[PDB]
Design a protein around this ligand. Structure first.
Ligand SMILES: [Ca+2]
Ligand SMILES: [Ca+2]
Ligand SMILES: [Ca+2]
Ligand SMILES: [Ca+2]
Length: 242
């Protein structure tokens, strides 16, 4: 069991795209979309947030500051590789990281999928519970371990609060984001994500922005039903760079 390594696809057209995964996901969330973008000429880089891929008790020794530092590091990696054109896309937490990147750096364009405008403590705890169960049926861990993993959740309360403030600080300052933006949500996701997408769209500073609700897409828009429609949309959006 280890955190996956980053994935770097070198392309030919001189433009680079960061691809950022979901909360409790890994960079396998974005593998297919990265591959399809690379087949259109783009260089693609998909980091993995620290702690992601590990058992819950190890996962919770990392926090949103660690995850953001890794995203900063991934941006700098592309700068150091010589790319003058860098763009970003991400799903769920990765969509939040994309928005934050755009507040800090001169990204060329951004595509944001399934970003929330706020998260409750129950909602985030519920993500962590599902993560630990999926992992126990994979790793076929005994019953005793599973329960201890979930009992450590109580000590993460301060880090949940930090994550909530992280979201609030991004959402307060959407007006400083000015480059072209594609805001996407799934019509088979919770209705709060449609409300979030409208909020984000309406508060962005960008003059060149679009809102795309995809009726067949679920929360993890890169996977499952509707994925072909999502990919065509995102690829069309980034191909405007060429
Ligand atoms: Ca293909
Ligand atoms: Ca390829
Ligand atoms: Ca703690
Ligand atoms: Ca609607």
């Amino acid at each position: 069991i280890k955190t996956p390594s980053p994935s770097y696809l070198k392309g030919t057209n001189g433009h680079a795209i960061l691809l950022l995964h979901s909360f409790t996901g890994t960079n396998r969330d974005v593998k297919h979309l990265a591959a399809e973008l690379n087949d259109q000429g783009f260089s693609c880089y998909a980091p993995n947030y620290p702690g992601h891929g590990l058992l819950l008790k190890d996962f919770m020794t990392y926090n949103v500051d660690d995850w953001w530092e890794e995203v900063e590091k991934a941006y700098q990696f592309l700068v150091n590789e010589g790319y003058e054109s860098i763009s970003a896309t991400g799903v769920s937490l990765g969509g939040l990281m994309t928005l934050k990147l755009a507040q800090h750096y001169p990204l060329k364009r951004i595509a944001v999928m399934s970003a929330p405008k706020e998260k409750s403590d129950d909602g985030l705890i519920e993500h962590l519970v599902y993560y630990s169960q999926r992992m126990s049926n994979i790793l076929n861990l005994d019953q005793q371990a599973s329960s201890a993993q979930l009992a450590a959740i109580d000590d993460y309360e301060g880090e949940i609060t930090k994550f909530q403030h992280f979201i609030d600080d991004i959402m307060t300052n959407l007006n400083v984001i000015k480059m072209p933006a594609n805001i996407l949500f799934g019509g088979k996701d919770a209705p709060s994500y449609e409300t979030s997408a409208h909020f984000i769209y309406e508060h962005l500073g960008s003059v060149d922005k679009e809102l795309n609700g995809l009726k067949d897409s679920h929360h993890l828009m890169t996977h499952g039903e509707g994925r072909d429609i999502l990919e065509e949309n995102v690829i069309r959006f980034f191909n405007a760079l060429t």
